[PDB]
Write a protein that binds this DNA or RNA. Structure first.
Ligand SMILES: [Mg+2]
Length: 276
DNA sequence: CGATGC
C-alpha cells in the first residue's frame, strides 16, 4: 500500500541539533544513474557524506561530473579486481576522514569492491554492497560465509569506535520489510539463513536498525523495486538498504529517512541524521 | 522475483 516518508526529524531524544547527514544509494551503475540526473538529486539533498553502491565503474574511469561536486570533494572508490561493470562502491565526504580502508580483512571476501571504511573523529563509517545469493540460492553458501566474516569484522571495528554501517545489505530482515514475504521465502534476499544472519548481526555486534528502531510498525517502506513489471509503480518492493548503528549512537539518532520518490536507480536513497 | 495458476 502507501508509504509517505515522514518529515525530517533533526533533533535527538536528547534534544541536540543534527550535525551530520549521511546519504546511501545503490545507483545501479554510475553512468546510467548520472544520465538519469542522480547527481542533481544529491546536490539538492546536500549530504555531508554520500555512500554509493553498484557503481559498476573502474576507479580510474569515473565520470567527470563527480569532479563537479563541490561539497563532497574527498572521494574514495573500490571496484572488482577481475570483474568490470559489476558491483563497486564509493564514499564521498565533505570533510576528510582520518583514515580509509577497503575490504573486511579477509582476502576471499575482498576481491569484488564491496566495502569502504572511513574513520572519523568520533565514529567509524562502513559502506557495503553485500553479495547477492543468486537467482535460486546458488551463491547462498558463499553468502552465509560472507555474513559470518562481515559480522566478525564489524564486531572488531565497533569494539574500538562507535560504528555506522550503511548501504545495500541485500536482505529484507522481517516480513514487514518486503511486500510479498510468502512468495519470496526461498528467494535471494529473504531466505531464513539470510534473515537469521542479519538478526545475528544486530545482536552479536551489536547494532540497531536505525529505521526500524524509529518506525517499528511502519509497513510498506521499501528501498528497492525490481524494474520487472514496473514493481515500483505498484510499491511491490524490499527494504534492502539500512543504516545500522552502535547502541552508543542511539542517543545521537535524529532520523533515518527513505527517499521513496528519488528516481535514477532500482533502489532509492536513504538518509541518516545524527547529532554529534 | 512479480506474475502465474496447482
Ligand atoms: Mg542491483
Amino acid at each position: 500500500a502507501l508509504y509517505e516518508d515522514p518529515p525530517d526529524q533533526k533533533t535527538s531524544p536528547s534534544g541536540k541539533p543534527a550535525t551530520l547527514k549521511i546519504c546511501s544509494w545503490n545507483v545501479d551503475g554510475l553512468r546510467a544513474w548520472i544520465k538519469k540526473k542522480g547527481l542533481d538529486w544529491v546536490k539538492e539533498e546536500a549530504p555531508d557524506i554520500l555512500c554509493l553502491q553498484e557503481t559498476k565503474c573502474s576507479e580510474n574511469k569515473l565520470p567527470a561530473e563527480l569532479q563537479e561536486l563541490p561539497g563532497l570533494s574527498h572521494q574514495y572508490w573500490s571496484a572488482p579486481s577481475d570483474k568490470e561493470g559489476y558491483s563497486g562502491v564509493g564514499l564521498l565526504s565533505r570533510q576528510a576522514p582520518l583514515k580509509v580502508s577497503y575490504g573486511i580483512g579477509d582476502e576471499e571476501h575482498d576481491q569484488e569492491g564491496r566495502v569502504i571504511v572511513a574513520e572519523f573523529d568520533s565514529f567509524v563509517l562502513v559502506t557495503a554492497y553485500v553479495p547477492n545469493a543468486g537467482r535460486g540460492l546458488v551463491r547462498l553458501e558463499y553468502r552465509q560465509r560472507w555474513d559470518e566474516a562481515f559480522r566478525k569484522f564489524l564486531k572488531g571495528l565497533a569494539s574500538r569506535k562507535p560504528l555506522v554501517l550503511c548501504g545495500d545489505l541485500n536482505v529484507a530482515h522481517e516480513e514487514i520489510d518486503l511486500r510479498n514475504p510468502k512468495g519470496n521465502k526461498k528467494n535471494a534476499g529473504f531466505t531464513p539463513q539470510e534473515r537469521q544472519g542479519f538478526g545475528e548481526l544486530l545482536q552479536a555486534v551489536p547494532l540497531a536498525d536505525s529505521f526500524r528502531h524509529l518506525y517499528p510498525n511502519t509497513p510498506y517502506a521499501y528501498t528497492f523495486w525490481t524494474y520487472m513489471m514496473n514493481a515500483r509503480s505498484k510499491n511491490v518492493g524490499w527494504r534492502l538498504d539500512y543504516f545500522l548503528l552502535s547502541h552508543s549512537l542511539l542517543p545521537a539518532l535524529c532520523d533515518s529517512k527513505i527517499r521513496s520518490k528519488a528516481l535514477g536507480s532500482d533502489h532509492c536513497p536513504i538518509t541518516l541524521y545524527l547529532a554529534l
